[PDB]
Amino acid sequence: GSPEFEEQEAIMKVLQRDAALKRAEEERVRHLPEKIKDDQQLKNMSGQWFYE
Amino acid sequence: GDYDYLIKFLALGDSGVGKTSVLYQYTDGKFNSKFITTVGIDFREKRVVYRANGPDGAVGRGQRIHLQLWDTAGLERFRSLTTAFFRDAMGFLLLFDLTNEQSFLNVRNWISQLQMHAYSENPDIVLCGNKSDLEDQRAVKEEEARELAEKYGIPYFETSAANGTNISHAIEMLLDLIMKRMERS
Numbered sequence: 576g577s578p579e580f581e582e583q584e585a586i587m588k589v590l591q592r593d594a595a596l597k598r599a600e601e602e603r604v605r606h607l608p609e610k611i612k613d614d615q616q617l618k619n620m621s622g623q624w625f626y627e
Numbered sequence: 628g629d630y631d632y633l634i635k636f637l638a639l640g641d642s643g644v645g646k647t648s649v650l651y652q653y654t655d656g657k658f659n660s661k662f663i664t665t666v667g668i669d670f671r672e673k674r675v676v677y678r679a680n681g682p683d684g685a686v687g688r689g690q691r692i693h694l695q696l697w698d699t700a701g702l703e704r705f706r707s708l709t710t711a712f713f714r715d716a717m718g719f720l721l722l723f724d725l726t727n728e729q730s731f732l733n734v735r736n737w738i739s740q741l742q743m744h745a746y747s748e749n750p751d752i753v754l755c756g757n758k759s760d761l762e763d764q765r766a767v768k769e770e771e772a773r774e775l776a777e778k779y780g781i782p783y784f785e786t787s788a789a790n791g792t793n794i795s796h797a798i799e800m801l802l803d804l805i806m807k808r809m810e811r812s
């Protein structure tokens with residue numbers, strides 16, 4: 576491919592890896608209520624605190 | 628998924644200052660001498676245990692952290708892409724090159740960009756003066772960098788991605804700052 580195209584290809588692979596990590600993290604957060612039911616700890620562990 | 632918190636940081640600074648090397652040294656304990664410039668953006672990961680009050684004993688106290696360490700390109704052709712990623716980072720590792728005065732003089736401009744585009748106007752930043760192993764090529768005086776860091780109220784570490792000096796220090800500091808912010812809020 577052109578350099579232009581190869582650059583987008585490379586960045587897309589990074590974005591795909593990030594997407595996989597995000598899905599894994601989301602599945603972890605889904606299962607938190609099984610073990611922790613204090614909603615403040617859930618907010619912390621889930622990362623929701625970062626969005627207030 | 629055997630961890631407790633996903634913490635996301637981002638490394639920024641001019642092209643060539645050592646952002647990729649710093650992160651790779653931290654996550655893998657390795658260093659490459661050949662300059663392989665970053666194609667827009669990349670990230671690395673590391674699983675660590677955060678212990679705010681020091682070592683525990685028989686009862687495990689630590690918080691298991693999965694670190695995602697975003698690695699941005701410094702060249703201006705990627706500036707819009709990399710700026711887009713500033714808003715989702717919880718804290719910043721801001722680098723300059725001890726052997727390159729201009730990268731240091733650009734620190735004020737990078738901070739201004741973070742204040743505009745970060746999640747907060749006053750985000751947690753750790754300043755790293757990198758390539759400390761290259762003393763014969765040094766162009767930035769420690770005291771000058773400390774003075775700058777002092778004005779902004781940010782920690783300053785002099786680091787080497789070559790041998791690892793102060794790398795874990797700088798990143799653990801940044802981790803401590805965001806975990807305390809979580810505690811605060």
Ligand SMILES: Nc1nc2c(ncn2[C@@H]2O[C@H](COP(=O)(O)OP(=O)(O)NP(=O)(O)O)[C@@H](O)[C@H]2O)c(=O)[nH]1
Pocket residue numbers: 640641642643644645646647648649659660661662663664665666699700701702757758759760761786787788789790
């Ligand atoms: N001696 C020494 N060389 C270093 C150090 N950090 C990085 N380098 C070298 O400096 C060059 C640039 O490093 P790199 O990590 O690629 O910089 P970058 O900030 O990621 N560049 P870009 O933003 O263009 O991706 C490489 O040749 C690398 O080996 C350091 O602490 N000591």
Ligand SMILES: [Mg+2]
Pocket residue numbers: 646647648663664665698699700
């Ligand atoms: Mg790089």
